[PDB]
Design a protein around this ligand. Structure first.
Ligand SMILES: CSc1[nH]nc(-c2ccc(Cl)cc2)c1C#N
Ligand SMILES: [Cl-]
Ligand SMILES: [Cl-]
Lengths: 138, 140
């Protein structure tokens, strides 16, 4: 049954391979490892989650955050672009992409990211953070 | 699909990481993909754009070509998802937002579509695209 999803490209979530409440528990445990600084374990758990459902925006954001913490900034930025697309109107991944671009020495790209947050987002606290980066970029 | 390939690659080096296909060859394959597309050979064009997006997913031109094919095929959610990737990457115009609005209308999500068309009117400098977006808004 699982092999069928491997051959059809479907997710494990599409075939309800693990119950909903158990997946919730695994996501909460992943976030616990993350908040405790247990980065290697959080990375295993967020990779597990993204294998289970690679369209879940919160699962992708968790793995992207791990990569950003590990200073794998391009790999983080790649996942953030997917996370943005799947959620359509949440500019948090665009904000974090701006941070990654600064670390990649691409300040004009970073400015474009933070400006996009300011222009489109309805999240006032997020826009405040984005503006503080814009104020600092030369 | 293209998005699942991108995520699996990120979970797990890639072909692009080793410069396995040079720029000029990718340019040629892109032009061949549109040759198929322009002749109505949509299935072959889809294979070629999928090939391009496996090699270099984070490329606005490849993403936009594949999104157009899904919209024509009435695979509206897949099209909307790819248009949003194109916009996030830096696509310097609001055309992917406009087309996402069209897709959301077909998905019976008129409130999502309204948000898309309103973004076009507020932020695009393409006066013709703005008129088109307003005509959809007038109908919602
Ligand atoms: C869920 S309401 C909504 N707000 N913004 C969008 C949006 C933004 C950029 C792009 Cl490229 C496509 C769509 C959207 C949708 N769908
Ligand atoms: Cl959507
Ligand atoms: Cl730059």
């Amino acid at each position: 049954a699982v092999i069928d999803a491997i051959n059809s490209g479907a997710t494990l979530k599409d075939i309800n391979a693990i119950p909903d409440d158990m997946m919730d528990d695994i996501y909460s445990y992943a976030y616990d490892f993350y908040n405790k600084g247990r980065i290697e374990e959080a990375e295993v758990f967020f990779r597990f989650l993204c294998i289970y459902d690679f369209y879940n925006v919160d699962y992708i954001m968790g793995l992207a955050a791990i990569y950003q913490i590990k200073e794998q900034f391009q790999q983080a930025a790649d996942l953030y672009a997917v996370a943005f697309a799947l959620g359509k109107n949440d500019y948090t991944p665009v904000f974090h992409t701006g941070q990654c671009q600064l670390r990649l020495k691409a300040p004009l790209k970073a400015k474009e990211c933070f400006e996009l947050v300011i222009q489109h987002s309805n999240d006032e606290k997020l826009k405040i953070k984005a503006q503080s980066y814009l104020d600092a970029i030369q």
